[PDB]
């Protein structure tokens, strides 16, 4: 249903390594290797329009957009506006704090001290509303929202910031790749997942899924690790 079709792709380029660019400005990462190779085989196109996060999303829930990625939460307020390919993987948030600020972090109840902060729009707002505020482990009008997580990443370098929210495989990105002295204090495991994102209805998504599974787990998981070291 896709052949010859163009789609109107929205990204939001800042989640290494689902998705972001080189110093040369080329667009990359997971996210892009994947649903390329989806449109090299259903010999489909991509207009991709980069966004801010609230508009990428805003842009596919509203079908202004065909298909949104840019390591996407699957979460359950957005699948009501917005409908998912089955998870590509499965995710971890940390709680991080530059490496010479020693926050030792033995329960929930210890969180209200410290400030938290994170890019606006992203799912960690669900977790905290959801599963921290009503325990009254912390409060979502006492976080620190970001354009994106470089200047998250900024206010922790400074000092302004006690502790970033950031998924797994970025602070892997901060840490390893670009050896910044961060660690993390805390871990969330495996309590998301990310997927491909598609307007309400779409027959790519269904058809999406089934490319996945053409793949198979290994071809998938390979892409995925390569990216991730």
Same mark, same amino acid.
């Given at each position: 249903?896709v052949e010859?079709?163009?789609?109107?792709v929205?990204?939001?380029?800042?989640?290494?390594?689902?998705?972001?660019?080189?110093?040369?400005?080329?667009?990359?990462?997971?996210?892009?290797?994947?649903?390329?190779?989806?449109?090299?085989?259903?010999?489909?196109?991509?207009?991709?329009?980069?966004?801010?996060?609230?508009?990428?999303?805003?842009?596919?829930?509203?079908?202004?957009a065909?298909?949104?990625?840019?390591? =996407?939460?699957?979460?359950?307020?957005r699948?009501?506006?917005?409908?998912?390919s089955?998870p590509y993987?499965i995710?971890?948030?940390?709680?991080?704090?530059?490496?010479?600020?020693?926050?030792?972090?033995?329960?929930?109840?210890?969180?209200?001290?410290?400030?938290?902060?994170?890019?606006?729009?992203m799912?960690?707002?669900?977790l905290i509303?959801?599963?921290?505020?009503?325990?009254?482990?912390?409060?979502?009008?006492?976080?620190?929202l970001?354009?994106?997580?470089?200047?998250?990443?900024a206010?922790?370098?400074?000092?302004?910031?006690?502790?970033?929210?950031?998924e797994?495989?970025?602070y892997?990105?901060?840490?390893?790749?670009?050896?910044?002295p =961060?660690?993390?204090?805390?871990v969330?495991?495996?309590?998301?997942?990310?997927?491909?994102?598609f307007?309400?209805?779409?027959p790519?998504?269904?058809?999406?899924?089934?490319?996945?599974?053409?793949?198979?787990?290994?071809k =998938?998981?390979?892409?995925?690790?390569?990216?991730?070291?």
């Open positions: 249903i010859g079709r163009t789609l109107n929205a990204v939001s380029p800042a989640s290494p390594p689902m998705l972001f660019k080189s110093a040369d400005g080329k667009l990359q990462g997971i996210d892009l290797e994947l649903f390329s190779s989806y449109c090299q085989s259903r010999h489909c196109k991509l207009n991709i329009t980069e966004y801010a996060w609230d508009g990428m999303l805003g842009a596919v829930a509203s079908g202004q065909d298909v949104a990625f840019s390591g =996407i939460s699957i979460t359950d307020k699948k009501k506006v917005i409908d998912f089955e993987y995710n971890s948030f940390y709680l991080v704090s530059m490496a010479n600020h020693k926050i030792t972090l033995n329960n929930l109840n210890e969180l209200n001290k410290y400030s938290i902060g994170y890019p606006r729009g799912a960690y707002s669900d509303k959801n599963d921290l505020e009503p325990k009254g482990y912390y409060s979502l009008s006492k976080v620190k970001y354009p994106t997580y470089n200047e998250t990443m206010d922790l370098k400074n000092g302004n910031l006690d502790l970033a929210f950031i797994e495989p970025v892997f990105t901060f840490k390893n790749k670009k050896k910044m =961060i660690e993390s204090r805390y969330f495991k495996n309590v998301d997942q990310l997927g491909i994102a307007k309400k209805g779409s790519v998504r269904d058809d999406f899924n089934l490319w996945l599974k053409e793949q198979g787990p290994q =998938i998981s390979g892409i995925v690790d390569s990216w991730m070291k």
